[PDB]
Ligand binder design. Structure first.
Ligand SMILES: CCn1c(NC(C)C)nc2c(-c3cccnc3)csc2c1=O
Ligand SMILES: [Mg+2]
Ligand SMILES: [Zn+2]
Length: 318
C-alpha cells in the first residue's frame, strides 16, 4: 500500500501544501532520497548530465544518512522540506524562465546538503565549548562551512560527476558553497540589504549568472526559513521541533554552566513567543523582499500564512 501512496504524493511535489512528514512516514524515513531522486528526473537532469542512476541513488543515500536523525529539527526531513520548497521557487516564472539545468542541479544539491551533519547545537555553542569545527573555520559560518565541506566530501566520494571536467566539478563545489553559506542566518542583514538595493534600483538581470545566483541564494534562504509560511498544521510541527532542539541545547548549557543561549531556556521562553519574534524580525522582512522580486500568488499565499500563523500563536497566549 505505502510504496503506492508515496508515488501518488510525488504527483503533487510542486504544491505549497505538500506534506513532507507523511511522505517520510510512508517511505520509512527515505523522504530526502526519494523526493530528490524524483526532482532530478522531473527536471530532466539525469539525461541532461548523463548521470548514472546507481551512483545518483548512492550519493543521495550518503547525504540522507549523514544527517543526525536524532536531532528534533536539523535532520534529513528538514533537508527534504527545504529541497521541496526550493523546487517550488524554481517553478516561479522569473526563475523558470532564466535558470539553466546546471543551476537547477546545483540549487537542489545545495538544498539537500545545506545542513549536512548538523550537530544539533548552534555556532556560539561550538565556539564557547572549543569545538574543533570552530577552530577549523575560525569562528565564521562554522556550521555552514561544515555542511559545505561535508557536501564536497560526498560529491567527491560518490563519483556522480566524475565524467565531467575537473573545472566543472570545482565550479560546482564553489557555487554550492556560495548557496549553503547564504543560509547562515546570522548574516541575513547583509544578504537581505544587498537584495533590497537591487530591488530598489530595479537593476537585476536574470540572464547574468551573478545576479541569478544572488536570487538563487535568496531563494534558498527563503526555503530554509519558510516553515511559518506553511499551513498551520505543518508550521506548528516545525515550531515544536525547532523549539525542542533549542531547549535541549539550553539544558546542556544549564547542566554544565556554559551560559544559556538566547531562545534556549525552556523556563523563560515559549514556543509562541519564539515564533512571533522570528516571524516579525526574520521571516517577514525576507518574504516581503522576496514578494517584490517574485510578485505571484505563491508569494502572497506564503505571506498570508505567516499572518495567519502569527495570529494563531498570539491566540494561544492569554
Ligand atoms: C525555520 C526554523 N527556525 C529557524 N531556522 C534558523 C535556525 C535557520 N530559526 C528560528 C529562530 C531564530 C531566531 C533568532 C535567531 N536565530 C534563530 C527563532 S524560531 C526559528 C525557527 O522556527
Ligand atoms: Mg543551517
Ligand atoms: Zn536549514
Amino acid at each position: 500500500d505505502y510504496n503506492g501512496q508515496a508515488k501518488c504524493m510525488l504527483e503533487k511535489v510542486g504544491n505549497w501544501n505538500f506534506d513532507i512528514f507523511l511522505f517520510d512516514r510512508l517511505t520509512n524515513g527515505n523522504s530526502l532520497v526519494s523526493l530528490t531522486f524524483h526532482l532530478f528526473s522531473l527536471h530532466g537532469l539525469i539525461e541532461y548530465f548523463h548521470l548514472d542512476m546507481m551512483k545518483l541513488r548512492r550519493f543521495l543515500v550518503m547525504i540522507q544518512e549523514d544527517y543526525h536523525s536524532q536531532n528534533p529539527y536539523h535532520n534529513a526531513v528538514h533537508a527534504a522540506d527545504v529541497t521541496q520548497a526550493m523546487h517550488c521557487y524554481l517553478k516561479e516564472p522569473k526563475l523558470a524562465n532564466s535558470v539553466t539545468p546546471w543551476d537547477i542541479l546545483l540549487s537542489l544539491i545545495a538544498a539537500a546538503t545545506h545542513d549536512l551533519d548538523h550537530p544539533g547545537v548552534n555556532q556560539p555553542f561550538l565556539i564557547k565549548t572549543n569545538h574543533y569545527l570552530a577552530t577549523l573555520y575560525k569562528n565564521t559560518s562554522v556550521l555552514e562551512n561544515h555542511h559545505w565541506r561535508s557536501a564536497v566530501g560526498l560529491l567527491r566520494e560518490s563519483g556522480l560527476f566524475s565524467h565531467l571536467p575537473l573545472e566543472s566539478r570545482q565550479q560546482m563545489e564553489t557555487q554550492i558553497g556560495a548557496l549553503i553559506l547564504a543560509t547562515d542566518i546570522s548574516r541575513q542583514n547583509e544578504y537581505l540589504s544587498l537584495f533590497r538595493s537591487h530591488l530598489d534600483r530595479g537593476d537585476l538581470c536574470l540572464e547574468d549568472t551573478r545576479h541569478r545566483h544572488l536570487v538563487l541564494q535568496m531563494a534558498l534562504k527563503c526555503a530554509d526559513i519558510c516553515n511559518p509560511c506553511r499551513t498551520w498544521e505543518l508550521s506548528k510541527q516545525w515550531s515544536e521541533k525547532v523549539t525542542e532542539e533549542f531547549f535541549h541545547q539550553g539544558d546542556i548549557e544549564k547542566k554544565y554552566h556554559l551560559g544559556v543561549s538566547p531562545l534556549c531556556d525552556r523556563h523563560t521562553e515559549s514556543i509562541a513567543n519564539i515564533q512571533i519574534g522570528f516571524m516579525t524580525y526574520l521571516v517577514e522582512p525576507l518574504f516581503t523582499e522576496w514578494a517584490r522580486f517574485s510578485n505571484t500568488r505563491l508569494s502572497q499565499t506564503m505571506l498570508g500564512h505567516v499572518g495567519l500563523n502569527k495570529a494563531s500563536w498570539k491566540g494561544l497566549q492569554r
